[PDB]
Amino acid sequence: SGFRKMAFPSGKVEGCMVQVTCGTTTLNGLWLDDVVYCPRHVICTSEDMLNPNYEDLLIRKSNHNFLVQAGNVQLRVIGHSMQNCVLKLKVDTANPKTPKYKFVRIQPGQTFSVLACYNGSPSGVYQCAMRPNFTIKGSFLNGSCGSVGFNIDYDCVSFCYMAHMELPTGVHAGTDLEGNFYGPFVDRQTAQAAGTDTTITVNVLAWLYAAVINGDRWFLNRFTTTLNDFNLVAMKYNYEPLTQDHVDILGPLSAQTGIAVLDMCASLKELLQNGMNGRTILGSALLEDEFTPFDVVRQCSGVTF
Amino acid sequence: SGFRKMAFPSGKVEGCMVQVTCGTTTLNGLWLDDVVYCPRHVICTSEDMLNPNYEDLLIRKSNHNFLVQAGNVQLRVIGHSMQNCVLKLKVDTANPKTPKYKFVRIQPGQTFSVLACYNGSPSGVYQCAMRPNFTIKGSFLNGSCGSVGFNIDYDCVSFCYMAHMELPTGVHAGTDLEGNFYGPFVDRQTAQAAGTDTTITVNVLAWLYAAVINGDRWFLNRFTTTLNDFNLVAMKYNYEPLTQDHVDILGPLSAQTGIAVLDMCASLKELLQNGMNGRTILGSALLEDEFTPFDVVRQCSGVTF
Ligand SMILES: *[C@H](O)[C@H](C[C@@H]1CCNC1=O)NC(=O)[C@H](CC(C)C)NC(=O)OCc1ccccc1
Ligand SMILES: *[C@H](O)[C@H](C[C@@H]1CCNC1=O)NC(=O)[C@H](CC(C)C)NC(=O)OCc1ccccc1
CA distance A38 to A28: 7
| Cα B166 to middle of ligand 2, angstroms | 5
Torsion of CA A286, A287, A293, A296, to 10 degrees: 20
List CB contacts of B221: < 8 A, sequence separation 6 or more: B266, B267, B270
Interface test with B, best of A113, A114, A126 (most B CBs within 10 A): A126
List CB contacts of A174: < 8 A, sequence separation 6 or more: A136, A149, A161, A162, A163, A164, A165, A181, A182
- Give the H/E segment covering residue B80: strand B77-83
Give the long-range contacts of residues B63-69, CB within 8 A, separation 24 or more.
B65/B22, B65/B23, B66/B20, B66/B21, B66/B22, B66/B42, B67/B19, B67/B20, B67/B21, B67/B22, B68/B18, B68/B19, B68/B20, B68/B29, B68/B31, B68/B36, B69/B18, B69/B19, B69/B21, B69/B120
Return the closest-CA partner of residue A242 out of A230, A225, A255, A252: A230
- Of the candidates A22, A85, A117, A145, the residue annotated as catalytic is A145
How many other C-beta atoms can be found within 10 angstroms of the C-beta atom of residue A277? 8
- Judge contact between A46 and A186, C-beta under 8 A: no
Is residue B49 lining ligand 2, measured as CB closer than 6 Å?
yes
How many other C-beta atoms can be found within 10 angstroms of the C-beta atom of residue A148? 26
CA distance B50 to A256: 30
Is residue B3 lining ligand 2, measured as CB closer than 6 Å?
no
Q: How far is CA B30 from the centre of its chain?
A: 16
CA distance A161 to A176: 5
- Judge contact between B23 and B45, C-beta under 8 A: yes
- Judge contact between B131 and B289, C-beta under 8 A: no
Q: How was this structure determined?
A: X-ray
| Cα A203 to middle of ligand 1, angstroms | 29
Amino acid code (one letter) for A82: M
Kindly report the backbone phi and psi dihedral angles of residue A273, in degrees, each rounded to the nearest multiple of 5, phi listed first: -85, -30
CA distance B272 to B260: 19
Ligand 1 atom with least separation from CA of A168: 28
CATH superfamily of B201-300: main proteinase (3clpro) structure, domain 3 (1.10.1840.10)
Do strands B156-166 and B100-103 pair parallel, antiparallel, or not at all (unpaired)?
parallel
List CB contacts of A158: < 8 A, sequence separation 6 or more: A101, A102, A104, A150, A151, A152
- Give the H/E segment covering residue B174: strand B172-175
- Judge contact between A174 and A163, C-beta under 8 A: yes
CA distance A277 to A248: 31
